[PDB]
Amino acid sequence: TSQVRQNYHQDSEAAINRQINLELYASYVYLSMSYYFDRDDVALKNFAKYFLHQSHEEREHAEKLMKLQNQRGGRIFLQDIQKPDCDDWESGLNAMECALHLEKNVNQSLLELHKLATDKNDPHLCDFIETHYLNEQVKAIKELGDHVTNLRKMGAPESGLAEYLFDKHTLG
Amino acid sequence: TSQVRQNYHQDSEAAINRQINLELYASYVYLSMSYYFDRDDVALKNFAKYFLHQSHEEREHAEKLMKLQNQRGGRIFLQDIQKPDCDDWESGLNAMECALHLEKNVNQSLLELHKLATDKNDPHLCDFIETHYLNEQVKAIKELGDHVTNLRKMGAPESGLAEYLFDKHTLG
Amino acid sequence: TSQVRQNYHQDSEAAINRQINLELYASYVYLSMSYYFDRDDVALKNFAKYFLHQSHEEREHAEKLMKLQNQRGGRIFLQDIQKPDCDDWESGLNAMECALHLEKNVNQSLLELHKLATDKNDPHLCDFIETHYLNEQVKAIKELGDHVTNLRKMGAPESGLAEYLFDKHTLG
Amino acid sequence: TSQVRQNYHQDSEAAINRQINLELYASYVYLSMSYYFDRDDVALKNFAKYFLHQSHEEREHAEKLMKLQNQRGGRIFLQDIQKPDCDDWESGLNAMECALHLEKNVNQSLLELHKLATDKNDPHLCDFIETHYLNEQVKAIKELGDHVTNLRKMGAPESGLAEYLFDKHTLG
Amino acid sequence: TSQVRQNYHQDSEAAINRQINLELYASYVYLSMSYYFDRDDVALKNFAKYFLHQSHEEREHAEKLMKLQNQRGGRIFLQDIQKPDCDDWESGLNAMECALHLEKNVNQSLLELHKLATDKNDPHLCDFIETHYLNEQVKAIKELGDHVTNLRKMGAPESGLAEYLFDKHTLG
Amino acid sequence: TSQVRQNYHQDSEAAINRQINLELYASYVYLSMSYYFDRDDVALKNFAKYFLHQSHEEREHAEKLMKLQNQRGGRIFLQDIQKPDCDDWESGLNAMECALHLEKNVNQSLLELHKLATDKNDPHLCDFIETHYLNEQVKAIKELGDHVTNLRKMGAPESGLAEYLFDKHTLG
């Protein structure tokens, strides 16, 4: 038991470790998406840049959780970072749809972590999740939904013109 | 009777109060339109920004009328601000068409207020309406007509590509 | 159902729409108060400025709720904005008392919205209300109570000297 | 009953007064520690500076609680500030250990105040404690644990060389 | 016996410790007064600011005595800081009267400490008290007397107008 | 077959994918080390900063390989990123020893990739590895060897004083 540990349940500590893994996994998914759009037979550079930026941001989200774990006197336990489900992400629209799905799963995990905090009467953890994670999730999901809608309305994925113009005018 | 009141007919005072309400109503219509384009299943941010700017401007038009009322020694009498006719505004083109209709109704009201000023021999009121309202109305109506024309010519509302490109290249 | 909607109860969505209306109503009350103090037979310009600033701020509070509604995938449903209870607000002290009453009612509404968030296990909504609304309400209520106290202690509303000096030295 | 008081339980008001006292007590403990390290037969100036900075900060924490009490319409009731348990704090390591103990007790008090807020359905108070107090406590406890660990690992308290070097390289 | 101790009587050391407590007590009295004027049913912000500034200054006076104690090789012995005599300070005038009384008591203590220095042939202590304390006391007492006189002459405490105007024009 | 692919052997493409994984693994190892030194019972902040910087750099090394893969018309195939061998890294010296071992393994992999380039007559790949990877590896290995030597010579790992001073004077 850490000299700093106070009001920090074992289940909370465990849930923080699972969340660290999931943020790293999200970082990996976006890394994979980024370089998909970098392929010469896809060649959408702003989609590539956009997803690379999200990949780095996910990694910072994981790091903030690792910091929290140590702050509370928990012990970080790392697990393998699983490869993403896809190697080929099909189209800008499909990637955006997949990202939306991803972010909703990450949000679901964060909402379960928050429920756990409530159940264990851990308001420091409640605040950490509310302040640093919940609104970032809502913003990300809204942004991704907006992107999906625009791409669909423009005629993606069948219209390569649509994806090209979106890459320049929204992601550019 | 106000110590400042001079050459200010009761009918003029009443008409100014109705005009205050109508400007507020216009502010509300544009507010509703703005957040329609902010929906995740619409997602046209510059349409949203454009209509939000018009909403604020309408509110300032109402405030200038309230100032005029007090300047002339009239008494402001506020009425409910009615919700707009629509909750769902359908498409960028439809919203622009509705705005054009709105502005022509506001203009018609202002032209009746001006006729009243003429009929009551109130040149201060004539000048107020001519200087601050009539050309703003003509400019707004011309701008909205231009937007409707472009959107129609581009293939809106069936072309979501059209609305997307207009949002970037005209409203952006 | 919105593609972005997650953990967002229908009752929460409905309560957000009622809160949007109430913020707009508060904007209207303060607008009415502002121009009351602008009357030539009242003529307290800093009271007028103070209430106009609050009117604009209320409108921004309503806009932030409309943004939240769309962020969460709810659907904004606007209602009429009711005219305020008063046309004539009597005195600076009376207006401040009325504002205090208003803000306590808005606070009560926000506390019920927060209870609903708790009851529906919606920590994103809890955070939104806590972060953006609850302390603003406490600050507003404390400020208005301070103003009421000063005005009473100075001899308002019977002392027009008192209201005049307060307008210059506190609201100026 | 204050004109501003709303949703503010008597038990919450009482708990805020006890917390004000405890913050003042913490300010006193750190003041005592600071001047201990200022003694000619101790003579660790950065330990002295570090604890003096914490003493001032505690006093500001107490002041923010007094502000909150008045904001909510509670009534501040001050109690004696008890002298610290020690006059002689022994060594840098011992002082850091004592500070760690202190901060964990302050944290425990804040967690009980937060539980009370939950129990009384006072989300404004929940937010105040979460936003302004809980993470400051976690940060302080982590920092103090880090200092204790370094000092122990360096050979303190038996190594005066260790305390000297820590004073320069960590607290300097 | 400290290696630095020279010409420093035990009675002087003891008197310095009592003076440290009294300065801390004065800091507490002013802290209590400050937040009294911050109450929503008092609401004199410059009285609040003025007394808060004095509270901080008293704390610095206590710190300078603790520094002196260590400089001379004495040993600081802290005592409880007693709560002030009042929770409710009644009016600006009454608070100023109480402050005047306080400062005259602090001055009396400092004059006894100076007599002790003379009696023990401790010119370093004489100089410390003369240079850093005696004229600050005379200035504080004169300032407080001036404030009391103005407030009385303006019609305080019965005139809340008087206290309001003094807060703006003297303490503002 | 990519339209851009030229002189790029399938075995080279495969080896680049394995190298991408190994760089990611190295990023993970350093991430784990970084937060180990961030623990309250380790508390060496510059060791933590140093390893965090290496973690980010490894991630950039992986990204440059993914860019190369696409440049050459190869297809990126991601694999799981394995958790590091250790959860607890024991001491600064042990972590540095482990890092040295890691970097020598990464170097061995890069030397095999270079041999493959030679064997497949791929001078573009030879140049890529020589220019961007081989000297970075030699520099990293030399730096880590220097750190190990200093730490051993200072008395690490038994001397916590040694690790503390190294953290400040070399990694600070």
Ligand SMILES: [Zn+2]
């Ligand atoms: Zn994330």
Ligand SMILES: [Zn+2]
């Ligand atoms: Zn990072």
Ligand SMILES: [Zn+2]
């Ligand atoms: Zn796997």
Ligand SMILES: [Zn+2]
């Ligand atoms: Zn994410």
Ligand SMILES: [Zn+2]
């Ligand atoms: Zn919570």
Ligand SMILES: [Zn+2]
């Ligand atoms: Zn909470």
Ligand SMILES: [Zn+2]
């Ligand atoms: Zn919060």
Ligand SMILES: [Zn+2]
């Ligand atoms: Zn208008």
Ligand SMILES: [Zn+2]
């Ligand atoms: Zn305005």
Ligand SMILES: [Zn+2]
């Ligand atoms: Zn209606």
Ligand SMILES: [Zn+2]
């Ligand atoms: Zn208009």
Ligand SMILES: [Zn+2]
């Ligand atoms: Zn005319």
Ligand SMILES: [Zn+2]
């Ligand atoms: Zn004319």
Ligand SMILES: [Zn+2]
């Ligand atoms: Zn003209």
Ligand SMILES: [Zn+2]
């Ligand atoms: Zn509001």
Ligand SMILES: [Zn+2]
């Ligand atoms: Zn706005």
